[PDB]
Design an enzyme around this catalytic site. Structure first.
Site, PDB file in Angstrom:
ATOM      1  N   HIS A 217     -11.113  -6.870  -4.893  1.00  0.00           N
ATOM      2  CA  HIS A 217     -10.001  -7.821  -4.788  1.00  0.00           C
ATOM      3  C   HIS A 217      -9.875  -8.412  -3.393  1.00  0.00           C
ATOM      4  CE1 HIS A 217      -8.887  -5.531  -8.510  1.00  0.00           C
ATOM      5  NE2 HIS A 217      -8.366  -6.705  -8.902  1.00  0.00           N
TER       6      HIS A 217
ATOM      7  N   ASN B 105      -3.592  -5.935 -13.182  1.00  0.00           N
ATOM      8  CA  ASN B 105      -4.573  -7.008 -13.352  1.00  0.00           C
ATOM      9  C   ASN B 105      -4.056  -8.022 -14.382  1.00  0.00           C
ATOM     10  OD1 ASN B 105      -6.558  -6.183 -11.547  1.00  0.00           O
ATOM     11  ND2 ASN B 105      -7.817  -5.109 -13.087  1.00  0.00           N
TER      12      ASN B 105
HETATM   13  C1  HDD Z   1     -10.902   4.983  -7.886  1.00  0.00           C
HETATM   14  C2  HDD Z   1     -11.192   3.773  -7.451  1.00  0.00           C
HETATM   15  C3  HDD Z   1     -10.602   2.594  -8.118  1.00  0.00           C
HETATM   16  C4  HDD Z   1     -10.239   2.487  -9.533  1.00  0.00           C
HETATM   17  C5  HDD Z   1     -10.669   3.343 -10.700  1.00  0.00           C
HETATM   18  C6  HDD Z   1      -9.362   1.283  -9.491  1.00  0.00           C
HETATM   19  N1  HDD Z   1      -9.372   0.616  -8.309  1.00  0.00           N
HETATM   20 FE1  HDD Z   1      -8.067  -0.939  -7.764  1.00  0.00          FE
HETATM   21  N2  HDD Z   1      -8.503  -0.666  -5.912  1.00  0.00           N
HETATM   22  C7  HDD Z   1      -9.230   0.349  -5.379  1.00  0.00           C
HETATM   23  C8  HDD Z   1      -9.919   1.285  -6.034  1.00  0.00           C
HETATM   24  C9  HDD Z   1      -9.745   1.592  -7.459  1.00  0.00           C
HETATM   25  C10 HDD Z   1      -9.293   0.341  -3.869  1.00  0.00           C
HETATM   26  C11 HDD Z   1     -10.729   0.329  -3.367  1.00  0.00           C
HETATM   27  O1  HDD Z   1      -8.648   1.503  -3.323  1.00  0.00           O
HETATM   28  C12 HDD Z   1      -8.499  -0.907  -3.529  1.00  0.00           C
HETATM   29  C13 HDD Z   1      -9.242  -1.915  -2.649  1.00  0.00           C
HETATM   30  C14 HDD Z   1      -8.301  -2.362  -1.521  1.00  0.00           C
HETATM   31  C15 HDD Z   1      -7.134  -1.432  -1.673  1.00  0.00           C
HETATM   32  O2  HDD Z   1      -6.166  -1.380  -0.928  1.00  0.00           O
HETATM   33  O3  HDD Z   1      -7.314  -0.552  -2.802  1.00  0.00           O
HETATM   34  C16 HDD Z   1      -8.162  -1.482  -4.889  1.00  0.00           C
HETATM   35  C17 HDD Z   1      -7.786  -2.760  -5.013  1.00  0.00           C
HETATM   36  C18 HDD Z   1      -6.909  -3.231  -6.100  1.00  0.00           C
HETATM   37  C19 HDD Z   1      -6.167  -4.520  -6.083  1.00  0.00           C
HETATM   38  C20 HDD Z   1      -5.823  -5.416  -4.920  1.00  0.00           C
HETATM   39  C21 HDD Z   1      -4.455  -5.017  -4.372  1.00  0.00           C
HETATM   40  C22 HDD Z   1      -4.114  -6.065  -3.337  1.00  0.00           C
HETATM   41  O4  HDD Z   1      -3.974  -7.240  -3.747  1.00  0.00           O
HETATM   42  O5  HDD Z   1      -4.147  -5.754  -2.119  1.00  0.00           O
HETATM   43  C23 HDD Z   1      -5.632  -4.605  -7.447  1.00  0.00           C
HETATM   44  C24 HDD Z   1      -4.732  -5.653  -8.057  1.00  0.00           C
HETATM   45  C25 HDD Z   1      -6.273  -3.437  -8.096  1.00  0.00           C
HETATM   46  N3  HDD Z   1      -7.176  -2.784  -7.335  1.00  0.00           N
HETATM   47  C26 HDD Z   1      -6.031  -3.119  -9.509  1.00  0.00           C
HETATM   48  C27 HDD Z   1      -6.607  -2.023 -10.293  1.00  0.00           C
HETATM   49  C28 HDD Z   1      -6.484  -2.016 -11.775  1.00  0.00           C
HETATM   50  C29 HDD Z   1      -5.493  -2.764 -12.628  1.00  0.00           C
HETATM   51  C30 HDD Z   1      -7.306  -0.839 -12.095  1.00  0.00           C
HETATM   52  C31 HDD Z   1      -7.625  -0.311 -13.436  1.00  0.00           C
HETATM   53  C32 HDD Z   1      -6.633   0.105 -14.197  1.00  0.00           C
HETATM   54  C33 HDD Z   1      -8.009  -0.503 -10.841  1.00  0.00           C
HETATM   55  N4  HDD Z   1      -7.588  -1.235  -9.788  1.00  0.00           N
HETATM   56  C34 HDD Z   1      -9.004   0.580 -10.729  1.00  0.00           C
END
Ligand code: HDD
Ligand code: HDD
Ligand code: HDD
Ligand SMILES: [Ca+2]
Ligand SMILES: [Ca+2]
Ligand SMILES: [Ca+2]
Ligand SMILES: [Ca+2]
Lengths: 671, 318, 673
Positions: free
Chosen positions: B61, B134
């Site tokens: 994202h 999402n």
């Molecule tokens: C275990 C790892 C992993 C899993 C399974 C998920 N993601 Fe995530 N997500 C992350 C690891 C993560 C992250 C790498 O930790 C991020 C990247 C930047 C942040 O701050 O967190 C993130 C980013 C992040 C962002 C951007 C937030 C922003 O705008 O700053 C959104 C909207 C989501 N994700 C949504 C979800 C949705 C709806 C999931 C499934 C239900 C999902 N993610 C699964």
């Protein structure tokens, strides 16, 4: 070249980073529908790594691509420089080059209009030597201290971060019009040099004057010129915009493919050499990075061949992590008192702390030298060495005085050119010698062809029409008018302002060779250029035609894509994925004429749009086998339009058109 | 809203970060055509700051845009949740929302075909509460440990970092075809939900089943649905591709403009609510993030209104 | 060992980090008396490196020292564990060990009263396996979430950062008295175990119960015990305080010197092994890290030999950068539901990000395994690998399904013990099985000798008398009283309060073997022990005597220091630099008697002070040559005292003195309540 650092995972069981065999597909849970356990170290080690994958992008030139290669010296250059990598005929030095845009973040499009980076590392037998250049030989500003002002103004507005990878907004043109030093680089950027056809079809420049220093201490002033052996070529703007959507990876893909196919790009590495006494002899100051030395005053000397012929194994490890510095200098070269250069030396050492997160960035494989390192630098996060010398201070007796000091007379040390001198007050003042910001922009403009000049006016029309502030727009016209009244009139017309009265202080009629793209003759090679053959699966004759065209074109090193409604044997790409931006020339096979007259397999009109796009963008286009040409409204008597029954006659004509590359008669001129 | 942290530079003389008035346009030199001096602290402070401006982009994202606004509760929802920001009719809580694509790096086009993020912070009177959602109500994979495999496969091939912001390459489809859990989200991403007309014309989903918990400790299972009041709309692919080139900023500009013109977008914040005993009552497992509860089996309860009505002051900081 | 990563600078010309030859002694200037130039990259690269040399110290155990070594298995232990480093008689595995104190920052003294760390990496043929232990077998607290509370209270008060490396302040004893789980470790730290003679004279414990897991999936519960082959020994407090000033580096020097002299220290690596069904069979819960299993219930099995025999080449690269984790686990070993252990697993992975500043810390040479790595971890700052696999995701076909998943049935994978099970509510609640905080502290105390008990009481008297709050001191007496009324009464006497009335709920008379220091008999070897010979240059006969003693003593592997007024051939150090803390025994040659009766060469009364301190601290002391009464009388030392020696015969003197060195301390010199 970096083989010692490679890791092979083509066999074997998954392990942790400490070599314990594990799995990584299911979390450890309390019960089969239960919560995940804190003690799952397999999960945490894997996800922690992923969480920390990203590093800061470069502050500028964030979007780029790299390759390995070799430099080969043409001669023993000891008579002009002590530089070891230039000291024998045929002497070879490994290189790594990164090309880039300038303003855009990671992920932005290769075909933005921009300055381009062309940074070259020579892993010499006397240390790493970097030439950190651009595809344009002059820079916007005259003092390093202004760099963050320039960059802030050019990058997206900081309340909303819009627009990406573009100077087409109020702040960039506010700065340009208030800081007229920017005029020369601006005119370059608004020319075809802003949108090169590839990294391979552009030159590289060191921009600054540097010094060549002999072993006897004497020095001369130099400019670096890397002259492309593929020739110079550009896109047109209306093509580039589409390309930026259709394939943001266009340049990096073009470079990758050329190397993979045994067509690695080459440049002649050249210098202009002039005497120290000629610092001010050419009507401007050689310390001023907004000025070129016309080749009429000082011809190029070819020093050697640069070739890129090996793609990286891991982009992040090699391309993303390569950390260039103009401070990476070797004996036989020295700096000048160019205040833009001067400040770069500070910036590139400091900035790697940001990117790497610690002080041992030179220990990354891509940054390591290819000779032994002997110094008393110690510790720091991420320290990879285990130093045997437990007395790392100078002067010492307890390590017998090692490492020993290197200098002009010992150990082949770097030395500052000994004739160099300073005199006068400690000042924050600009030299009056820098004060002419307009003559050379006019020199450049004068040296472009009529249609080239039109393209540049039209780029300014495009950008300046997007500037919201009336007062900024007026200020821009004031500056352009100091370069050329006619330019100011022609761009003012597009924006509904009146041009200011002619002000002829800096007007003149002089020209200089080597700066024009469209004027530089046909390309010296057409190998790698892309031909799209538009065909159909609905006629076997069409496919036979396409196959026969393929065989004849591929002989000559062209990359041929046969397009049809669906994939099958002999067809590379569907009309759904095909676009004219993907081809350097477009051929329609007679047998497919019906397609150019609806389908669930591609957007309505797609086949004819490709052909029409290509024509309007100046490409060689043809039918092999008048019906098609009528539907396209393309004139059979057009230069770069081809119409032949015989495949052999067609190809022979069409390949001439590919070398011409663009037919500029297809573009309207002012008045 | 963050007014206490704002810095005004509409007047005054240039200072260092420690309040000493300085200039910043010419380097200090030994003579008018001389070398620059190490003692030029003006130069070095400004350039050091510049050299260090960038931070790592988000791991996913990375490309996105945000706005401030307000959430307003339609009722006292104590009957289903102890949550304070839901405890009174008309109760208002400030929010901040970021929207995004998923695969692309931070300068990639808004109108790539992708999953989109819709992340909402409620600055509640009992602490910050984030719903990190999402525009598509199901996810590709069924265990968080597989997250890097998915992301590696979807992001550019790691020898050449091609292609940007796209699943249209061998690795992504190799993963999809070897890991069939991906099918549901893939179908969503290949529909118009992959190329929404704007952030304003998409919904937001929490994806996971969560729990609503009363003060008496009883719980019910919920899904979050943020339902657009602007309607749902998409691009066509062949338009999206051209748009990605003509205006990479289309979605962020659309949002900025709607807010500046007094047309700040709105969602109804809704939940599906079902009993703990219904976890497997619907022909699938509510713990499985690749499934929706069809609305025929459980209707939306509208909890309140989310409106975005204020653009940030500094994009980086906020 | 890490030879591949070594850099030699015994020859050659100075270069930059990118191999360009340079100088580094004078700045580039505009004129001979002018300003320094920005274009001086030689200056900037050198100074930037220096500016960035330091990294965060460890959050605890910041003060420590390390060595390389080898572990040798005594058997094929397949019968109890699948662990590969234990799978054959004579199998050898390289190790690295770091020892440490606990509370103090970098640069604090080795000989603070503290818990000590004893962290061992085995670079096994199936991955790195760390045992991250202490010299005390039980810990302060029963849940990992309480760690920052413990550590905040024990470290210096946060307004002024006083006091350094000490539990002797209000906040520490406030915590101890409010969190009675702390009692057991506290009693240990207040004993001689809090001030060990050296890293070589202390044991190592894993503390937690772990599991041994067989290839058939069955598991047993284990405790790790590393048992010193050098014997157990401690300083006395009044000695340790002075030592902390005279030589902050005492333990690290001791260890370095023992290795350099071919006397590398050894431990027997042992386990207690019990059945899963005995988790609660010994009168307490094996999940509880504040408890020992008394060895009367579960004897030690000796698995193999740990020997340290090679010092590091670069301290910072090897010792400072070593990053231990209990999460560094191998097949054949598993965790238990010890809620302290459980949380550690998170902490040690996370904290390395702080120390290293990035995610690739396992790529540091001291952290690398000695087997191939195959995984899909990528990128991150400081990435040192160039990965050839361009399809790093699972499942894949594009890299043919590699790397392959390893588990119980394939590829020798780690696997959780499959007998392991959970049941019940998701709770933030403490098991009532954990609630006896006092009985085992009493067992420990009961097991010390009388004088040893007095030493412990006196450490408590010392520390608690520096606690300023009256209420804290009362609260401390309350908890002490629940362990032993006599302890409460005796500590209370020193601080001018009354002990609370006896409360006998947890009193008992049980003892357990092997926890006493002063009771563990004479040391098994006196090699490396330090003998100071006090002599004089004023008599050529005094130096002749010193020389005879040296020869006789060095033959038996003692480290002999001859001390006189000034250096010369045969004299190792001056009275000016000499101190009793530098010696395990002190001999005066009777030719130097007149010194014990002013010089610009050393502080007034220095020679006599060294002898008096040595005696009062319990060391063997003597006069060699036959005339003893002038030295002994000046020192108020009785000729007939135990551990006081007086012989004309050099041979006879040494034979007697060496028995005193093995006895180590003469505890009859200390008063009892
Ligand atoms: C275990 C790892 C992993 C899993 C399974 C998920 N993601 Fe995530 N997500 C992350 C690891 C993560 C992250 C790498 O930790 C991020 C990247 C930047 C942040 O701050 O967190 C993130 C980013 C992040 C962002 C951007 C937030 C922003 O705008 O700053 C959104 C909207 C989501 N994700 C949504 C979800 C949705 C709806 C999931 C499934 C239900 C999902 N993610 C699964
Ligand atoms: C005082 C600031 C300063 C000024 C005056 C310059 N730049 Fe620069 N340049 C940087 C500070 C900077 C930097 C911020 O330090 C970068 C960004 C990331 C990095 O490693 O260095 C850099 C990036 C960098 C890159 C990308 C290197 C790569 O591929 O990794 C190129 C090609 C250039 N610049 C070239 C130039 C040229 C030809 C300039 C004018 C002669 C110039 N820069 C002026
Ligand atoms: C949850 C937090 C916490 C808990 C409950 C523990 N510690 Fe720990 N320990 C850490 C948090 C941690 C740490 C902060 O993560 C350290 C500091 C630096 C590091 O690498 O890990 C560490 C340092 C560390 C060191 C130094 C390792 C080295 O030499 O580099 C040793 C010997 C121990 N501890 C041993 C123990 C023992 C035997 C424990 C009780 C059974 C224990 N720790 C409980
Ligand atoms: Ca703007
Ligand atoms: Ca791919
Ligand atoms: Ca305190
Ligand atoms: Ca950092």
């Amino acid at each position: 070249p970096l083989a010692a650092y490679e890791v092979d995972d083509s066999t074997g069981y998954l392990t942790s980073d400490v070599g314990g065999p594990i799995q990584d597909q299911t979390s450890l849970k309390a019960g089969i529908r239960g919560p995940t356990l804190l003690e799952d170290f397999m999960f945490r080690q894997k996800i922690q790594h992923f969480d920390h994958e990203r590093v800061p992008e470069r502050a500028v030139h964030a979007r780029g691509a790299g390759a390995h290669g070799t430099f080969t010296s043409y001669a023993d250059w000891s008579n002009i420089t002590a530089a070891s990598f230039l000291n024998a005929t045929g002497k070879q030095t490994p290189v790594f080059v990164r090309f880039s845009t300038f303003a855009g973040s990671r992920g932005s499009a290769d075909t933005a209009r921009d300055v381009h980076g062309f940074a070259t590392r020579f892993y010499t037998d006397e240390g790493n030597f970097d030439i950190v250049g651009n595809n344009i030989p002059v820079f916007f500003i005259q003092d390093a201290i202004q760099f963050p002002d320039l960059i802030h103004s050019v990058k997206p507005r900081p309340d909303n971060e819009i627009p990406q990878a573009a100077t087409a907004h109020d702040s960039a043109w506010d700065f340009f019009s208030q800081q007229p030093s920017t005029m020369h680089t601006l005119f370059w950027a608004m020319s075809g040099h802003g949108i090169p056809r590839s990294y391979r079809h552009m030159d590289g420049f060191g921009v600054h004057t540097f010094r060549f220093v002999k072993d006897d201490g004497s020095s001369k002033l130099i400019k670096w010129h890397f002259k492309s052996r593929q020739g110079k070529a550009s896109l047109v703007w209306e093509e580039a915009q589409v390309l930026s959507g259709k394939n943001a990876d266009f340049h990096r893909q073009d470079l990758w493919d050329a190397i993979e196919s045994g067509n690695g790009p080459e440049w002649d590495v050249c210098v202009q050499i002039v005497d120290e006494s000629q610092a001010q002899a050419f009507g401007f100051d050689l310390l001023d990075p907004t000025k070129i030395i016309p080749e009429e005053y000082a011809p190029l000397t070819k020093l050697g061949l640069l070739k890129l012929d090996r793609n990286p194994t891991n982009y992040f490890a090699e391309t993303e992590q390569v950390m260039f510095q103009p401070g990476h200098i070797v004996r036989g070269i020295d700096f000048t008192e160019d205040p833009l250069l001067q400040g770069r030396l500070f910036s590139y050492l400091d900035t790697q702390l940001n990117r790497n997160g610690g002080p041992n960035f030179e220990q990354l494989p891509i940054n390591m030298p290819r000779v032994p390192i002997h110094n008393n630098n110690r510790d720091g996060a991420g320290q990879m060495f285990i130093h045997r010398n437990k007395y790392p201070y100078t002067p010492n007796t307890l390590n017998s005085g090692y490492p020993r000091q290197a200098n002009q007379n010992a150990g082949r040390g770097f030395f500052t050119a000994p004739g160099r001198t300073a005199s006068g007050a400690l000042v924050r003042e600009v030299s009056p010698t820098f004060n002419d910001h307009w003559s050379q922009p006019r020199l450049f403009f004068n040296s472009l062809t009529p249609v080239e000049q039109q393209f540049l006016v039209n780029a300014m029309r495009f950008e300046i029409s997007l500037v919201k502030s009336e007062e900024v727009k007026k200020n821009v016209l004031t500056q352009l008018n100091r370069v050329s009244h006619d330019v100011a009139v022609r761009v003012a017309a597009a924006i509904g302002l009146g041009a200011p009265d002619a002000d002829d202080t800096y007007y003149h009629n002089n020209k200089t060779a080597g700066v024009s793209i469209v004027g530089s003759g046909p390309l010296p090679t057409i190998k790698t250029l892309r031909v799209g053959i538009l065909a159909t699966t609905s006629e076997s004759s069409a496919l036979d035609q396409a196959a026969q065209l393929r065989t004849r074109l591929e002989k000559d090193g062209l990359v041929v894509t046969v397009v049809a409604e669906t994939l099958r044997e002999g067809v590379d790409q569907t009309y759904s994925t095909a676009d004219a931006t993907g081809f350097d020339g477009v051929v329609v096979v007679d047998g497919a004429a019906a397609l150019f007259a609806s389908s669930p397999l591609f957007p309505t009109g797609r086949p004819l749009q490709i052909f029409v796009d290509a024509y309007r963008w100046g490409k060689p286009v043809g039918v092999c086998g008048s019906e098609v040409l009528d539907a396209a409204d393309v004139p059979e008597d057009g230069d770069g339009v081809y119409s032949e029954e015989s495949v052999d006659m067609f190809v022979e004509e069409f390949e001439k058109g590919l070398a011409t590359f663009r037919f500029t008669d297809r573009f309207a001129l002012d008045s």
